[PDB]
Amino acid sequence: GPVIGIDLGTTYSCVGVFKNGRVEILNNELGNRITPSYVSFVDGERKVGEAAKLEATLHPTQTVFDVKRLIGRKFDDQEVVKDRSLLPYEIVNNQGKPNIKVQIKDKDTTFAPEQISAMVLEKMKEIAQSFLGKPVKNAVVTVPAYFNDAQRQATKDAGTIAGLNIVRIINEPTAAALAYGLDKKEETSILVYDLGGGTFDVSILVIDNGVFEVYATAGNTHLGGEDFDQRVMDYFIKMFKKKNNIDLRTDKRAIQKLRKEVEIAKRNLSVVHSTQIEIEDIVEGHNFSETLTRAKFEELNDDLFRETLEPVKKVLDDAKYEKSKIDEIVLVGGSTRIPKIQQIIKEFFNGKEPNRGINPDEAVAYGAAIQAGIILG
Numbered sequence: 001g002p003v004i005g006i007d008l009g010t011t012y013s014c015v016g017v018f019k020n021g022r023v024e025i026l027n028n029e030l031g032n033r034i035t036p037s038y039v040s041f042v043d044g045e046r047k048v049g050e051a052a053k054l055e056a057t058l059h060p061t062q063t064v065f066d067v068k069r070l071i072g073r074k075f076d077d078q079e080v081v082k083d084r085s086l087l088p089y090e091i092v093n094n095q096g097k098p099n100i101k102v103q104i105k106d107k108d109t110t111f112a113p114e115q116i117s118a119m120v121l122e123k124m125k126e127i128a129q130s131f132l133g134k135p136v137k138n139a140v141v142t143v144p145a146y147f148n149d150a151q152r153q154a155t156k157d158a159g160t161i162a163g164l165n166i167v168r169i170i171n172e173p174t175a176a177a178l179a180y181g182l183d184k185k186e187e188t189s190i191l192v193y194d195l196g197g198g199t200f201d202v203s204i205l206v207i208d209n210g211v212f213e214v215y216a217t218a219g220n221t222h223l224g225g226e227d228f229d230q231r232v233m234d235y236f237i238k239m240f241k242k243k244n245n246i247d248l249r250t251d252k253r254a255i256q257k258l259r260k261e262v263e264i265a266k267r268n269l270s271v272v273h274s275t276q277i278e279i280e281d282i283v284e285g286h287n288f289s290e291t292l293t294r295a296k297f298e299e300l301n302d303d304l305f306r307e308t309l310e311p312v313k314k315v316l317d318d319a320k321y322e323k324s325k326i327d328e329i330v331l332v333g334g335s336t337r338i339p340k341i342q343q344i345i346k347e348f349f350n351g352k353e354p355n356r357g358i359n360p361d362e363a364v365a366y367g368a369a370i371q372a373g374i375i376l377g
């Protein structure tokens with residue numbers, strides 16, 4: 001049978017196959033290589049991916065996401081207490097563990113995190129099956145290096161529910177190191193800087209004669225590209241109020257349309273210096289039309305960008321490493337395409353350039369597919 005590779009991310013998943021000596025990262029049915037890790041339970045229908053994420057605006061309590069934050073944890077863990085206060089869907093205490101409670105045709109229905117992760121895995125499986133034109137029973141799935149045995153087992157149990165035998169769990173730093181094809185000979189120390197949509201992770205990964213070991217991990221569980229978008233949102237909501245006497249927060253639809261254009265403007269500003277954010281009738285009879293510059297984008301987010309260095313100092317300290325001891329810096333996550341992020345890391349490493357890919361959102365799934373290939377020989 002085939003073995004596919006799946007990056008089960010906090011905010012998104014990504015699936016790759018190894019076939020005819022190449023890794024193919026697969027498109028979902030909307031033509032995207034990244035699928036939002038969302039599941040909606042509205043109006044007697046269950047949706048997974050972007051179609052579910054679009055329900056979050058009008059049905060926030062029925063639109064489940066960020067389940068990776070809960071999986072294999074305890075209801076009373078300090079992190080889960082925080083996540084319950086942030087997440088808009090109901091989380092209940094089932095015998096010491098967080099479960100998700102929603103309604104299906106008005107009936108209360110409770111799910112383990114691994115039942116919701118299983119639905120994401122099922123969708124990635126179906127993309128692979130369609131593409132390979134055969135059934136898929138086996139996968140390599142990625143986890144964060146800091147995941148404990150209960151978090152790993154809960155991820156494997158998600159696979160079993162989705163009809164996937166997870167033949168190997170590999171950590172996200174190792175997957176990145178496989179994708180970038182880092183030389184496995186001799187000893188090299190690698191700083192893997194992973195800045196995603198919602199989470200920041202940094203790891204020191206040591207490769208020694210083909211053996212991969214994560215010597216230290218740190219991060220910020222509530223720092224990612226979505227926060228940079230929110231800083232921009234906050235700025236233009238204040239401006240629109242000043243100019244128009246309209247508080248766009250009073251209209252949830254207006255906020256949804258703004259967040260979509262702000263996320264595009266942010267991407268543009270990784271390449272250009274100035275971009276237009278435009279929504280016709282953001283509310284009836286009022287257009288939104290603004291310019292954002294890279295300089296203002298950076299100014300709005302500079303403290304968040306610099307916060308990413310605090311986990312870098314922590315892993316260098318935990319590992320008793322000098323900065324010079326790092327041989328190579330590898331960037332993962334779309335947010336590492338931000339020029340200021342790259343500059344800040346370079347300058348922290350007293351001038352050393354970070355290695356980055358071209359598709360840093362897909363590098364982990366790519367490495368998971370390589371690992372699948374490695375396992376089949």
Ligand SMILES: CNC(=O)[C@H]1O[C@@H](n2cnc3c(NCc4cccc(I)c4)ncnc32)[C@H](O)[C@@H]1O
Nearest residue numbers: 196197225226266267270271333334335337338
């Ligand atoms: C969607 N998944 C994520 O991990 C996050 O990654 C962000 N994300 C993707 N892509 C980005 C970008 N792209 C410009 C670009 C394009 C090509 C080359 C170069 I240099 C630069 N800029 C800034 N954040 C970017 C998203 O906005 C989420 O928050």
